[PDB]
Symmetry: D2
């Protein structure tokens, strides 16, 4: 075998991450082998101690990888032999590297998803709490990055929490299909020794066992969807990244990141660069990249097993480490950023109540198109008089429409503006509180696993 080939085929570098799960998978298989009558009670005991010792070497970071080790599987097989003798060879009876690969990677994914869940929920929890505490703060709502209408700083935070919560539900859905045992599938036709797959299921703690050996070996649906969900979740973070970065400029001045999540120079001690947020926005590309790569690897592949499939491991490991890092950095930013209630308050302008003034007429029976026009004049009449809209005269307004009354003054209040949105999901205070309740009930259920 050519050197440049075996190097390109090598995977020991990164798949060492599967060392622990590889062992657990062999332990279970050994146990079931004993039940099948392939191993004796004695041999099994020799294989477990051996395997467990190998487990310790890795955990202690003392395992010795050698030149020959093509992958983590061979590595672990070599060690067991060195440690217990040719007896270790009986372990591979009926087994196939083909099924180890998917078994280990799924085991690794289950464990990984457990951690990603934790951090993902902590991020959501962090956004919801902040929304609860700052429920009074109001600032501009944007469209086309232009000021549209007032909204509660909380409605903004909750819109992100809501999106991230759908991400938590999707992750949960992926987890169920990853939680299905492929071991006992052989090279492609099944285990040839009537292995007790049910027993294998509960040793590894999988929810159920794979239905078809050919599919179980050649499918990488779990990788694709984990990657797809990972990507959409990063898309949500990239969106939030964009928001905070813009809000964190000096032009906007709505908030300032904490020292731990920013960079700056002594020459401009007040300037803070949102490195953390930019780092996170970029990971969306990194993750999408991995998703696209695997979608391309699977397309057109004949059945059953093909070497092309080996590309999954690295992609899955990178994305796992990417999410873990990114979620935690996100939690921190949101937790420690400093808002300027004063600046957000100043961003609220009279111009932004032209919409509200139109609605005021609508409530008094005036038709949509006419009220709109009416407010249109008030806004124009204000330009002429060279004054802000809230300082026009009741006498001025009345020249526009008889329907304006002393009670029109309330329109020019921002709290009144937001409180207009009581309908479920709106930005009114009750609606913000309703959302914080809904999201907490949601997280209690999603975590009840």
């Amino acid at each position: 075998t050519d050197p440049i080939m075996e190097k390109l085929n090598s995977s020991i570098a990164y798949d060492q991450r599967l060392s622990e799960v590889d062992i657990q998978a062999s332990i279970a298989y050994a146990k079931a082998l004993e039940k099948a009558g392939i191993l004796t009670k004695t041999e099994l005991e020799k294989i477990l101690s051996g395997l467990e010792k190998i487990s310790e070497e890795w955990s202690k970071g003392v395992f010795v990888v050698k030149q020959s080790d093509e992958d983590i599987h061979t590595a672990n097989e070599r060690r067991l032999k060195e440690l217990i003798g040719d007896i270790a060879g009986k372990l591979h009876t009926g087994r196939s590297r083909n099924e180890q690969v998917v078994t280990d990677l799924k085991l690794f994914m289950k464990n990984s998803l457990s951690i990603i869940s934790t951090h993902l929920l902590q991020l959501i929890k962090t956004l919801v709490e902040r929304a609860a505490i700052e429920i009074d703060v109001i600032l501009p709502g944007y469209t086309h990055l232009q000021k549209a209408q007032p909204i509660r700083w909380s409605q903004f935070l909750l819109s992100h929490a809501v999106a991230l919560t759908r991400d938590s539900e999707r992750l949960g859905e992926v987890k169920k299909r990853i939680n299905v045992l492929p071991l006992g599938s052989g090279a492609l036709a099944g285990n040839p020794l009537d292995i007790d797959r049910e027993m294998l299921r509960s040793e590894l703690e999988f929810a159920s066992i794979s239905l078809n050996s050919m599919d179980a070996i050649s499918e990488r649906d779990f990788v694709v969807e984990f990657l797809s969900v990972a990507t959409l979740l990063l898309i949500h973070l990239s969106k939030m990244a964009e928001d905070l970065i813009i809000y964190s400029t000096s032009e906007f001045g709505f908030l300032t990141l904490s020292d731990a999540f920013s960079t700056g120079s002594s020459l401009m001690p007040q300037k803070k660069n949102p490195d953390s947020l930019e780092l996170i926005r970029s990971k969306a590309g990194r993750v999408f990249g991995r998703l696209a790569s695997i979608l391309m690897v699977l397309k057109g592949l004949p059945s059953t097993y093909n070497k092309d499939l080996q590309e999954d491991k690295e992609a899955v490991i990178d994305v796992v480490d990417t999410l873990t890092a990114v979620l935690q950095v996100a939690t921190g930013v949101i937790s420690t950023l400093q808002i300027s209630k004063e600046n957000m308050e100043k961003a609220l302008t009279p111009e932004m109540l032209a919409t509200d003034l139109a609605l005021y007429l609508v409530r008094k029976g005036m038709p949509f198109r006419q009220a709109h026009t009416a407010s249109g004049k008030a806004v124009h009449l204000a330009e002429t008089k060279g004054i802000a809209i809230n300082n026009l005269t009741l006498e001025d307004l009345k020249s526009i429409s008889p329907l304006f009354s002393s009670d029109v003054s309330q329109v020019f209040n921002f709290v009144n503006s937001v409180e207009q949105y009581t309908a479920l999901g709106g930005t009114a205070k009750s609606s913000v509180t309703t959302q914080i309740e809904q999201l907490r009930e949601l997280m209690k259920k999603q975590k009840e696993q």
Copy 2:
């Protein structure tokens, strides 16, 4: 008001597919506007009566679009106004285009999804049913596209059916997040007229209402999911298309497609090209593209609404039609293709039973490594004698290991070979049957 700029906004060319759903949403909103007092019982009467005729117009293909109509929403907005007068204007009270866009698309998707589902369950049923009938057939199981071990053709068909079964599951899931009402979100802060969203929910038949107005106007998670599940579905089909394409070459000769799904020529009557399978294989790329575009569109956009979001429509609509066509074509190919039991069988060689020769010794007590060596020495010994290992003499095998008894003959039998895989999920007959039962029960939980 710039000529080319206008060209880019025009969507009316493709979004007329939302004509009926747009009308239904306006109908639901009007009703709620009456309940809020924005419209009088009378006004409502006249608004629906109009909306209804706009619907009937579209359904009957009679609706007539004008050069000024820049998109389906504007078209119905203009048609209603010229059918009932200035009164039409009150219909837009407190309502935002930002919310019509998502409401209509979610309705369109919900509907298309039922249709997709029916076509998908049909494909699955065709594979399962065929696996049931051709269960006795046996052919090579491949790895690296080299003959690995003997498998049942049914196991091959069910592996694909199982994969599509997961596709059906994901679809249902996407469906639940799509079946949520976004109406009453305003342009971003919500409905300013305390609209009854529960009423709108019931009228339109959604399962629940969107939780946050900002999130509801700006997210296209529902699109990305649909495109992702769709791409994976197509990936599965691109895999099946490849197997059948290779299996239908004259070299392999396992099957032949019907004339309905193949092309040929008069100079070579027996030659059949599987372009139905080729079209299908290529659509995996098409669908993948739409997925990549929307992702790219969403990345980095700030809250809340941004013109960029308008790209979703065309992508969703294409993928929906592509899926509907591809599935039906898939089903036909599967049920009318003709397999050659003879050729699939002549393809099984004794060289594939060397693995079985070793298991034989393993079942007789020998540990794996030595069994593999023994089987290997027998394989080698045969090359030496220039014959097939199934033609070795018992004396020849005992020459390699006393463990070999006269019964070893039972090894060189392809039925006995596949019948070793009884463990759940294997290719053994009992196990294939079990898969068929399990799949029938899933198809049933799927319909529900």
Copy 3:
């Protein structure tokens, strides 16, 4: 054939766009069939008269399509027969639809790329000229979207002209490989009747001819790189859009779009939505998708021809009309946007000059590290006295380092600040003026590359 399968093959809707180039290809081939002996001069004349007739029917827009037409190559094949009958059949002698497809597509791309370049050079021109006019405007330069060292507005404008100019170079390069004649490759083994390929080349005006029939028929490199370069170009525009969109926010107040390329309402008539720029940003995704699809279509496909290759047509045309419209709208926006020198100036602040203050000590000999510390103490003490750095005293300054002189008073001036960058590529006026000459030249050469 199955009904749904027929819908899957129907490409007539979008491929009519190749009607003209298809007819040009037939004419070429036809004439080459005469020279080959397969046709008589008489026959050629009767076929050309028919083809020419069809051409007009498309150009006049009066061609009637039948529900029988699955694709453009069929519509013409039939229509020619309706016109001249049986003699039309000889035109397809030795020809393969597999070669009609790429030939027609390469012709359409050539014609198209010629249109696209026109618009691209025009966009680049716009930026460059406007750059010269507004060469005096100065505003903040950003990194991390936070203010760094001030720069000239023109420098900004030119950064986009330069990137766009590389896009133009890449298109020129794609144009070359596209401009290779595939006609005469047959189904996959080449033309069997020894047709004069070079003659077809001349007639069709291709630079050269394809080297391998199998490669010619099965490759789609020309589609891939075309979508590739377009995608990069859109990336550049998506970046420029992000810039202008943000610069157009009332929060920044640096510029405003004309009404022709914006949106707004009567309630807030003083506000403008950057619709144009947002559409364009979104189109980067659209184009990228088309790129992704063809890449997936082609991966792992076997030699030589497969129906899969049919997915190229639509993608190409879509990307062509997107580029064509996006560039035009992009030129309009840049052309009509109104800036605010008043605000771009204000955004310029004293804190942005601490760097210059430190450089100042470098010019006077002090090493970088020590000078960095020096400037540090300076902006720090300016804080203590609660005053802007520019107002410290020569003594306050002298207390930090004896090296401070009274000339440091020039340090607190923006124009001087930008004028520090005289090295090629920098924002200094002469460096900017130089770039404007270079761009004009590059555009000259590219313009004269067609």
Copy 4:
């Protein structure tokens, strides 16, 4: 300061690959720094002495790292400070880490592209040379993965060589845009000390210098272009891998890969698994992933520098190494693979010559349709008499058309079949020879300018 945050910056793990080039970028800025006046001739010698030492510690594996060094630059600076003292600091005068990263990346790409280019040409030479030697082998060419008509093995090999040739040309175009110096751009406004950029260019050996500092700092075109080109190249390989994998099946039995590039078991000695081709085909996705990723990263970014740009380094290094191995593995696969002339020949059938039998009539003046129809009858007749068309009798064929003459017996010969395609690009032997010479010529050109 946050720990997780710091693991996301630690690029040392992979950017060490810029160690040597980073040092060269500095050795060049120092020398330029001296000319500017910032350094003394004695200082320069001192600084260069350090760098020139640091360069060795890496090129010998001794450069000890530190869990304080986030990136390769910080690592290289640290070791310079330790080697020469506070004088090192001056090396950073006016220099911005923003320009160091682009400078280092392009230099690393210029070097890598040159190595890659060598392997690419080796692959191409391996296919063109083998095509010459095995130019007589004839096998069926496929469309829709079905048999269409005889072709020369060499016509197949050359088609892949031709596609790879265009990759070679694209890579060459990309190298010219990467060979442009961005050093001297500062943080975004340019170098503030009038550094001599021409001196830098010459020292580092670039062809020209960047035109605009803002662009030079923020553009990642060179990463995108390289990724695009590398993806098309891999697609080409994914297609070659598919053909060879399929041709290596026992079903086709056309060729066999060597053990060095295959896998198998003692249980089935003859079975050989094309792992080499499979690994290669899969990389098409991996490399494409990198391209998708960077395109998303740049899309929508505002000017100028943004931390996001930091995702370029790893993608580039990964594709460089992926391209390097894949190309060598391919060359080894083609060169050491064994073909089966016998089986390639047994695959050629008479049914495949009906087409030729039709062209036989055409060349004698019969119109296509009539000739095609006529060939159809010969085929049906053969079914009738239950024999192959080469067995039909002259009297038999006459009964179909009086145009058939005894010389028609020469239609039924496979060498004769391929020989019909003499038109430039076709599968005839003279064409295959012209192609080989044309390719040998191209490689020459593309090799000289590399």
